[PDB]
Amino acid sequence: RPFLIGVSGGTASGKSTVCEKIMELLGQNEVEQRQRKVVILSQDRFYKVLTAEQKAKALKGQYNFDHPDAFDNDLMHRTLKNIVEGKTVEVPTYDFVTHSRLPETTVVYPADVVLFEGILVFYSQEIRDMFHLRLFVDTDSDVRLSRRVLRDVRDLEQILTQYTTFVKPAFEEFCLPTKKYADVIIPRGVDNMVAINLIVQHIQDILNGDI
Amino acid sequence: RPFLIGVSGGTASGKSTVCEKIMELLGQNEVEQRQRKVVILSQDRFYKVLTAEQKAKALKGQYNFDHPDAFDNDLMHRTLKNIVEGKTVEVPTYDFVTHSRLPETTVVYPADVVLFEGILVFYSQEIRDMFHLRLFVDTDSDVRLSRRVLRDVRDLEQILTQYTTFVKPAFEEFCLPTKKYADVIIPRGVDNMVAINLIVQHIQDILNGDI
Amino acid sequence: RPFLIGVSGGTASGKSTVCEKIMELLGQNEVEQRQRKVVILSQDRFYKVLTAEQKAKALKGQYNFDHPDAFDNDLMHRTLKNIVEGKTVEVPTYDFVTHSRLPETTVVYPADVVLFEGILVFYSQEIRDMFHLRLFVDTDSDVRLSRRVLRDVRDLEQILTQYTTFVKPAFEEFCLPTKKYADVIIPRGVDNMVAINLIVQHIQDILNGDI
Amino acid sequence: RPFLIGVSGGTASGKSTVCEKIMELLGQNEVEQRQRKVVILSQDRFYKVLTAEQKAKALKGQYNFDHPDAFDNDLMHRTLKNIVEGKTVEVPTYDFVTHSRLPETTVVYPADVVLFEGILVFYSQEIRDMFHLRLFVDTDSDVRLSRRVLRDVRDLEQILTQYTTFVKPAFEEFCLPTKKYADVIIPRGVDNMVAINLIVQHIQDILNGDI
Numbered sequence: 001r002p003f004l005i006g007v008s009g010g011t012a013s014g015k016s017t018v019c020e021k022i023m024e025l026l027g028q029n030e031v032e033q034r035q036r037k038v039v040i041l042s043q044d045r046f047y048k049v050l051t052a053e054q055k056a057k058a059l060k061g062q063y064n065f066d067h068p069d070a071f072d073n074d075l076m077h078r079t080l081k082n083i084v085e086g087k088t089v090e091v092p093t094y095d096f097v098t099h100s101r102l103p104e105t106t107v108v109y110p111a112d113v114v115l116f117e118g119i120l121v122f123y124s125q126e127i128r129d130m131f132h133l134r135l136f137v138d139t140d141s142d143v144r145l146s147r148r149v150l151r152d153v154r155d156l157e158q159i160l161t162q163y164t165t166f167v168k169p170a171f172e173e174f175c176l177p178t179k180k181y182a183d184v185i186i187p188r189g190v191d192n193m194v195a196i197n198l199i200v201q202h203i204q205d206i207l208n209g210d211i
Numbered sequence: 212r213p214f215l216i217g218v219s220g221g222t223a224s225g226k227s228t229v230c231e232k233i234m235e236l237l238g239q240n241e242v243e244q245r246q247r248k249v250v251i252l253s254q255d256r257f258y259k260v261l262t263a264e265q266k267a268k269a270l271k272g273q274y275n276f277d278h279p280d281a282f283d284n285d286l287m288h289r290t291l292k293n294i295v296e297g298k299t300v301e302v303p304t305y306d307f308v309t310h311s312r313l314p315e316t317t318v319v320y321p322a323d324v325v326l327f328e329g330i331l332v333f334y335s336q337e338i339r340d341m342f343h344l345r346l347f348v349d350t351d352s353d354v355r356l357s358r359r360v361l362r363d364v365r366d367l368e369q370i371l372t373q374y375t376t377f378v379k380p381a382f383e384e385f386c387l388p389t390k391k392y393a394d395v396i397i398p399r400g401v402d403n404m405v406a407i408n409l410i411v412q413h414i415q416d417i418l419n420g421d422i
Numbered sequence: 423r424p425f426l427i428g429v430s431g432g433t434a435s436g437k438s439t440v441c442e443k444i445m446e447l448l449g450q451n452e453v454e455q456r457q458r459k460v461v462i463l464s465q466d467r468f469y470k471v472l473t474a475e476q477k478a479k480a481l482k483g484q485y486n487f488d489h490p491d492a493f494d495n496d497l498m499h500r501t502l503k504n505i506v507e508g509k510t511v512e513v514p515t516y517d518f519v520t521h522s523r524l525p526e527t528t529v530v531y532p533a534d535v536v537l538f539e540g541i542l543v544f545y546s547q548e549i550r551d552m553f554h555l556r557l558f559v560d561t562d563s564d565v566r567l568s569r570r571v572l573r574d575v576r577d578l579e580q581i582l583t584q585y586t587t588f589v590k591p592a593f594e595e596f597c598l599p600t601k602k603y604a605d606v607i608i609p610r611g612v613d614n615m616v617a618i619n620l621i622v623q624h625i626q627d628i629l630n631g632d633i
Numbered sequence: 634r635p636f637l638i639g640v641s642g643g644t645a646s647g648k649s650t651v652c653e654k655i656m657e658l659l660g661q662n663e664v665e666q667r668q669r670k671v672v673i674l675s676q677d678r679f680y681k682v683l684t685a686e687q688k689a690k691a692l693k694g695q696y697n698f699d700h701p702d703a704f705d706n707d708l709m710h711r712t713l714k715n716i717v718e719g720k721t722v723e724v725p726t727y728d729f730v731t732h733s734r735l736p737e738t739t740v741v742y743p744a745d746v747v748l749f750e751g752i753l754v755f756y757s758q759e760i761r762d763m764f765h766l767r768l769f770v771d772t773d774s775d776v777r778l779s780r781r782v783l784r785d786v787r788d789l790e791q792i793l794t795q796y797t798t799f800v801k802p803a804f805e806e807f808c809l810p811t812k813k814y815a816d817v818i819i820p821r822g823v824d825n826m827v828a829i830n831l832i833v834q835h836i837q838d839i840l841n842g843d844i
């Protein structure tokens with residue numbers, strides 16, 4: 001207590017939407033963040049505040065957000081470490097529209113189960129070993145790219161060039177190799193209701209005190 | 212009731228040894244086959260009795276046991292179909308040392324959970340849909356070949372030539388594509404105790420009547 | 423004489439742009455189609471004229487152009503067969519904007535070398551064996567999808583949904599397996615100038631009569 | 634002059650047997666090493682002389698010969714560097730039966746073409762860029778393992794355990810990623826006569842002074 005489930009996989013592999021489904025099925029959606037027993041935590045809350053020079057390149061499409069270094073791993077490891085110790089933590093909120101954290105900060109009170117979703121959430125030895133259960137959402141790259149593209153019409157040519165030069169390699173070099181640390185691999189994502197139901201059942205067991 | 216879990220994956224991927232582990236952890240080993248609630252059933256019990264001409268080629272290394280046609284799919288589908296209906300079934304025993312069934316025949320009484328392990332156990336639509344949960348033991352081919360080789364010193368040159376000409380293609384053509392039907396993928400095999408424990412817990416839940 | 427080089431690979435893998443480069447380097451661009459010794463021939467000239475009902479689905483994004491059946495294989499095989507016999511052929515021109523052939527028709531006079539580029543140009547045994555040399559442009563799917571997308575802004579949501587439901591499977595089922603027939607595999611495409619130069623040199627040798 | 638062709642690929646992928654075929658077809662076999670114009674050079678001549686403690690582990694199956702560090706890269710780079718400068722070099726001979734170099738040493742006189750075959754022959758930037766043409770023999774791991782096994786009956790259990798714990802990872806980590814540097818990929822190996830003939834023709838062109 002608390003039971004950490006880590007969920008990795010590529011960008012647009014289905015991590016977020018799977019975790020949401022698990023919160024939805026557990027009914028934890030119908031509850032305010034202070035009252036929850038199961039809570040999702042996203043690694044992408046822990047992006048580093050970019051410098052002038054970094055934000056510069058970020059505008060000109062020339063900055064890599066899929067590299068380990070892109071993430072404030074210390075803040076991350078320290079947060080987790082406190083969550084694990086049963087403490088209330090304040091987590092930041094990143095804005096991709098400005099490439100920086102919001103003034104305000106999310107409180108997360110102790111949970112029984114923590115779903116920790118992120119592209120590089122199994123990259124570091126120290127963090128890997130904190131998880132009781134390790135899930136990897138396996139979704140082919142071309143499928144993921146199509147999801148990501150359609151999801152980012154909120155300009156093509158920047159998005160696509162940024163993918164091929166920075167994202168594709170970073171994925172292959174840092175993210176894909178950590179799949180070997182997965183305990184269970186979940187093909188597809190939110191269409192794998194049998195897989196989700198299996199995980200929900202397991203979370204139900206923990207909560208009910210049957211495990 | 213009864214809950215069918217199908218487990219596929221390559222030869223020497225770890226299906227048998229994983230299923231054994233699950234029986235061991237559930238304690239179902241310490242019980243006689245008539246008394247069991249969880250029971251393993253192997254597709255490789257359902258190999259066709261070879262003809263003269265077929266057994267001929269089998270000796271001369273020239274017969275393919277990894278092709279769908281190699282299996283008595285009717286007997287198989289009919290057995291399952293009766294198991295599902297809650298009936299006691301008689302299953303055959305194949306002898307690779309003679310390439311034929313033994314005179315005697317194994318009785319399998321109703322179980323609550325049935326673990327059904329086989330290389331092509333998700334090949335046919337009619338059989339796939341019978342399973343409540345579908346597991347695929349993902350173990351790389353070179354690892355599997357090493358297991359199979361070491362496991363078959365009971366002559367190299369026949370085994371290896373038989374692999375490259377008949378087994379490698381049959382695996383790739385018929386077996387590997389059915390991975391897409393897996394609900395949960397289990398990397399490694401019997402070294403994935405977190406995965407096994409998750410499945411055992413789930414089987415425990417069914418048995419206890421918590422699901 | 424004439425020397426057939428077949429070039430396959432995925433959509434947007436680089437087949438067309440590689441073949442163009444080879445024509446450019448051989449200088450065959452600076453020559454009218456009647457005067458050429460090296461000529462490119464695209465399988466996508468041989469799409470079937472769609473019916474009313476087929477064109478219907480084509481509009482509603484619901485028709486598969488990456489299936490073997492999508493191509494007029496008879497016309498194709500017959501054309502090739504005549505090219506091989508040293509004859510002048512008339513080839514059709516397809517319009518994706520109307521999903522039908524143009525009234526007019528391209529004449530192709532005997533060449534010494536024929537570059538035959540297509541997604542399924544190694545699918546059929548009868549056609550495979552006509553090629554003296556078989557090239558496969560290997561470019562990862564996510565890279566290809568990005569090329570195809572950017573190349574088809576001439577609407578996202580139709581293009582992307584059409585890819586995932588029809589193109590991704592057809593590629594994997596029919597196209598990717600024919601890579602095993604490739605003699606030489608060319609990673610990347612038009613950025614592989616060493617590979618192209620090797621092929622150009624070889625074409626130069628044939629032409630010069632050094633082979 | 635001299636034209637370096639580098640050939641990489643896994644152990645038992647077919648590098649050696651392909652290079653031999655190219656020497657055989659060029660007729661360079663029928664010539665003494667001092668008289669040759671085309672010469673093969675194997676990276677596995679450049680293994681480090683093991684220490685007491687290293688040879689110890691080598692006996693007890695516990696030493697990794699597929700790691701970059703396993704090779705005397707300085708000697709290697711220096712040899713190549715001199716070959717490239719048109720000089721006669723002395724190359725060592727390694728004995729796996731004793732894990733050390735032989736007293737005597739092979740002289741290699743200037744060649745016009747040098748075929749340089751090795752598992753990690755594209756690993757280092759400095760060495761990669763020396764090659765005019767870069768070939769990668771792509772042969773699936775299970776096929777390679779079967780070749781290697783049958784080839785090393787000159788004890789199973791040591792060979793197989795040594796593969797899974799040391800060779801499989803080293804291959805995946807160091808060797809397989811360098812495939813991206815290949816100019817041309819040759820599937821299969823010595824059964825790809827069309828590929829070999831293409832390379833032989835090219836070597837013939839260089840020699841004849843047609844390139």
Ligand SMILES: Nc1ncnc2c1ncn2[C@@H]1O[C@H](COP(=O)(O)OP(=O)(O)O)[C@@H](O)[C@H]1O
Pocket residue numbers: 010011012013014015016017018117147148151188189190191
């Ligand atoms: N079956 C599916 N599973 C998961 N995501 C899907 C599916 N179908 C479409 N999508 C879309 O793909 C994207 C997946 O990204 P998401 O799971 O939210 O982030 P990540 O995978 O990086 O955690 C979303 O925009 C989602 O709506």
Ligand SMILES: Nc1ncnc2c1ncn2[C@@H]1O[C@H](COP(=O)(O)OP(=O)(O)O)[C@@H](O)[C@H]1O
Pocket residue numbers: 221222223224225226227228229328358359362399400401402
């Ligand atoms: N970690 C492992 N998981 C599974 N099998 C292993 C493992 N390590 C060694 N083995 C051996 O590999 C072989 C696996 O074959 P098995 O699982 O019994 O058949 P199949 O995989 O065809 O169902 C066995 O001989 C087993 O002892």
Ligand SMILES: Nc1ncnc2c1ncn2[C@@H]1O[C@H](COP(=O)(O)OP(=O)(O)O)[C@@H](O)[C@H]1O
Pocket residue numbers: 432433434435436437438439440539569570573610611612613
């Ligand atoms: N290095 C490259 N090689 C090949 N095509 C490239 C490259 N970089 C960008 N492209 C673009 O990708 C697309 C490749 O498609 P093309 O080769 O013309 O068709 P196909 O690959 O289906 O034969 C083109 O739009 C081309 O301009």
Ligand SMILES: Nc1ncnc2c1ncn2[C@@H]1O[C@H](COP(=O)(O)OP(=O)(O)O)[C@@H](O)[C@H]1O
Pocket residue numbers: 643644645646647648649650651750780781784821822823824
């Ligand atoms: N078609 C083939 N191509 C290459 N090697 C083959 C083939 N068929 C069998 N073999 C055997 O596989 C092994 C390949 O190893 P080799 O090419 O000599 O070393 P490496 O691939 O490490 O350079 C050899 O023992 C060879 O006889």
